[PDB]
């Protein structure tokens, strides 16, 4: 009975990934819903008294790579509560009955450590609409999930069941009834893309301006957040390729701060960068040409049919996440 | 053994018969089946036998577990709210011993009532499933549901199921009373809004509740509850939109108003202490915004499958 | 460990069915290719040192009943090496993730 809690104690993370609300570019409706879900019942407990109850479940859905796990990291950072990060490897067991006793002990620990947050990434693996799947695991896990979510003699009060999935239409109808907040996280718009570029570039010394970031956001038409992250990564790795595949360096302005340039200048010394020791390194600064080359190299991942499926799911049972 | 100390609840959740909006036939059937053998014990003897099996079904989120909570509140009897988690073990034979001792304790604690939520977790139709944990448990439940001569006085089995066509036909025939819980009508919608608002101050009238129930076309009970929750949370969002606060009348009860007024004290909202914030009142516009936000959680395929099931086994 | 080896020990044949190379008519190029690829690394291993490597797989296709399994019987006869005769019933299993381990 204690080995179950010892196995489930590895699902409570204590690393606290530093993702703040200013790190998330856009998604103001989802951020406001998560704020009124977690920040308010701990900061202002004198408002949720009587017939006013907080939210008891939020389903984040959308295209792959839009920021659902990033909002989960931001909630785990700024929640100041117990965060349960479970998956299909922490609930399914080899024996018989342990696959439901683990879920019962997980919800018992979540109710014992209230206020607590249960984050189940990829809820479509556990809830497979119980029509054709494996009888034992599917039926028992889904029914125990329903009973531990509301049930009769459980009274789940103060816990939050976060869920992030890419396939929202393959959920069970009872699970979709349990998740009382269907929040659609879409692909980012122009202002969100420009703020995401401003966040991902950071304190790197570059000649880019706000008009340059605006033209970059206008260029990335249909990109996702991971695609913006990898074109920022490619544009940041571009000065390393510039300092690798070039010769005829030149000391600019400091203990020989030498920089690659055109062959033939005021001191175009023909040597290699491997002989250059550290801290006499003046790499070329970022321009718009490196980000244009990163845009030309890296291609968008999300197609234009899954967007139609997510749009049909929003018009069927979904809200908007701005 | 002693592991069944969590199947019975001692909380008694305060859900009375007036809280259950609508469902008059199911309410009166559960009422007679839980009251009349305790009210008039001479009425049930021999031929005129009471109901020993009650099954509830319909769309998901219509009031099955709510009716079970109402029975557990206004029954005055031992409630056995147990599911498939406390019936299956790692060993062999203990999965039958659990059901045997469960029915033994339920017969020893007469008058009792056993409520099995999601009974399809025990009825996998034994196609190619787990033998020792499916078929033997199903036959044990079939021979322990043979209390038409054994448990004439005492226990009563219940059932709540969202998907009732995937159910074993033997236990379906053993459940003699199968009541279909439908989507609520307009009067049930209006009294459900009246119950869910409750003692919260508002300006909503009976005509406002009637047009709210007319706007909710095809909504369910949980959808009505989360619409009421969103309408309750909307004045907190209006306070969070803090601009040009204004004091009303005791001991500095502030209230935000339109930008540009008489006495528009432009300040924040977190600088003020508690118990002096006169919150705005519930209009109909926040309710209409919650209606436009919240979507119905049920589809048309489940409704036609429920219609097929009730026309096949009404 | 022991179950997989006990199931796969029956695939090795030790009966050595006596079909010589003269018992097959025609097929000169296939006979030469199979003859070198089974005989020469066993007989003269000093000819394949470094840059030169023997053949690592031969497909014998054609119409049904042309002597493909008879040619395989000839290779199994005059191979003087271990012969594994597997089929669909020895590799495919009922459990999940058991055929790949086999």
């Amino acid at each position: 009975n204690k080995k179950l809690r010892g196995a489930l104690s590895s699902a409570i993370l204590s690393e606290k990934p530093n993702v703040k609300w200013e790190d998330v570019a856009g998604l103001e409706g989802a951020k406001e819903a998560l704020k009124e879900a977690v920040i308010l019942p701990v900061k202002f407990p004198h408002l949720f008294k009587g017939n006013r109850k907080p939210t008891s479940g939020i389903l984040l859905y959308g295209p792959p790579g839009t920021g659902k796990s990033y909002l989960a990291k931001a909630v785990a950072t700024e929640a100041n509560s117990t965060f349960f990060s479970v998956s299909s490897s922490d609930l399914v067991s080899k024996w018989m009955g342990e696959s439901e006793k683990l879920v019962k002990q997980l919800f018992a620990m979540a109710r014992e450590n209230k206020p607590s947050i249960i984050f189940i990434d990829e809820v479509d693996a556990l809830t497979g609409t119980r029509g054709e799947g494996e009888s034992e695991a599917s039926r028992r896990i889904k029914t125990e999930l329903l009973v531990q979510m509301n049930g009769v003699g459980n009274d789940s009060q103060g816990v939050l069941v976060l869920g992030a999935t890419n396939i929202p239409w393959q959920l069970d109808s009872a699970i979709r009834r349990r998740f009382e907040r269907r929040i659609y996280i879409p692909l980012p718009d122009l202002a969100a893309r420009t703020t995401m570029f401003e966040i991902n570039v950071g304190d790197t010394p570059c000649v880019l301006t706000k008009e340059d970031y605006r033209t970059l956001g206008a260029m990335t038409e249909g990109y996702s957040g991971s695609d913006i992250a990898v074109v920022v990564k490619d544009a940041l790795m571009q000065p390393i390729r510039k300092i690798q595949s070039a010769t005829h360096f030149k000391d600019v302005s400091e203990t020989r701060k030498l920089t690659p340039c055109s062959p033939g200048d005021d001191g175009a010394i023909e040597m290699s960068w491997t002989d250059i020791e550290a801290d006499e390194l003046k790499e070329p600064d970022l321009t718009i040409k490196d980000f244009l080359k990163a845009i030309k190299s890296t291609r968008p991942t999300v197609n234009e049919d899954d967007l139609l499926k997510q749009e049909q799911f929003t018009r069927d049972f979904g809200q908007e996440g701005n | 053994r002693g592991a069944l100390s969590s199947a019975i609840l001692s909380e008694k959740p305060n859900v009375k018969w007036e809280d259950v909006a609508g469902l008059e036939g199911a309410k009166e059937a559960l009422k007679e089946a839980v009251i009349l053998p305790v009210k008039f014990p001479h009425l049930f003897k021999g031929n005129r036998k009471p109901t020993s099996g009650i099954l509830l079904y319909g769309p998901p989120g219509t009031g099955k577990s709510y009716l079970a909570k109402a029975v557990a509140t206004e029954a005055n009897s031992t409630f056995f709210s147990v599911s498939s988690s406390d019936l299956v073990s790692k060993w062999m034979g203990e999965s039958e011993k659990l059901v045997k001792q469960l029915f033994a304790m339920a017969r020893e604690n007469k008058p009792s009532i056993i409520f099995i939520d999601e009974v399809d977790a025990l009825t996998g139709t034994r196609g190619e499933g787990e033998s020792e944990a499916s078929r033997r448990i199903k036959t044990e439940l079939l021979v322990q549901m043979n209390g038409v001569g054994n448990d004439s006085q005492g226990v009563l089995v219940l059932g709540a199921t969202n998907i009732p066509w995937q159910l074993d036909s033997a236990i379906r025939r053993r459940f003699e009373r199968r009541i279909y819980i439908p989507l609520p009508d307009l009067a049930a919608r209006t009294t459900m809004f009246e119950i869910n608002v409750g003692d919260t101050p508002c300006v909503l009238t009976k005509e406002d509740y009637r047009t709210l129930g007319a706007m909710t076309e095809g909504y369910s009970g949980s959808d009505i509850a989360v619409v009421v929750k969103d309408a309750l949370m909307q004045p907190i969002r209006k306070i969070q939109s803090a601009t040009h606060f204004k004091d009303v009348s005791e001991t500095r009860k502030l209230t935000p108003c339109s930008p540009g007024d008489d006495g528009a004290i432009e300040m924040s909202w977190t600088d003020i202490e508690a118990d002096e914030l006169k919150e705005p009142d519930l209009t109909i516009k926040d309710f209409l915004k919650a209606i436009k936000s919240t979507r119905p959680t049920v589809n048309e395929d489940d409704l036609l499958k429920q219609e097929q099931f009730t026309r096949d086994f009404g | 460990n022991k179950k997989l080896r006990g199931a796969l020990s029956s695939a090795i044949l030790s009966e050595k069915p006596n079909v010589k190379w003269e018992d097959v008519a025609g097929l000169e190029g296939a006979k030469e290719a199979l003859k070198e690829a089974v005989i020469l690394p066993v007989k003269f291993p000093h000819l394949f040192k470094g840059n030169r490597k023997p053949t690592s797989g031969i497909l014998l296709y054609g119409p049904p009943g042309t002597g493909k399994s008879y040619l395989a019987k000839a290779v199994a006869t005059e191979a003087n090496s271990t012969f594994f005769s597997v089929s669909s019933s020895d590799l495919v299993s009922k459990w999940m993730g058991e055929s790949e381990k086999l």
């Binding site: 024996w95 018989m96 | 190619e128 499933g129 787990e130 | 009922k94 999940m96």
Partner: peptide, 20 residues
């Protein structure tokens, strides 16, 4: 008896509980 271990089979899934 002893413990009962759940296994997995393939169709064309189920739970063939081969105990010890």
């Amino acid at each position: 008896g002893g413990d009962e271990i759940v296994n997995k089979v393939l169709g064309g899934x189920x739970x063939x509980x081969x105990x010890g």
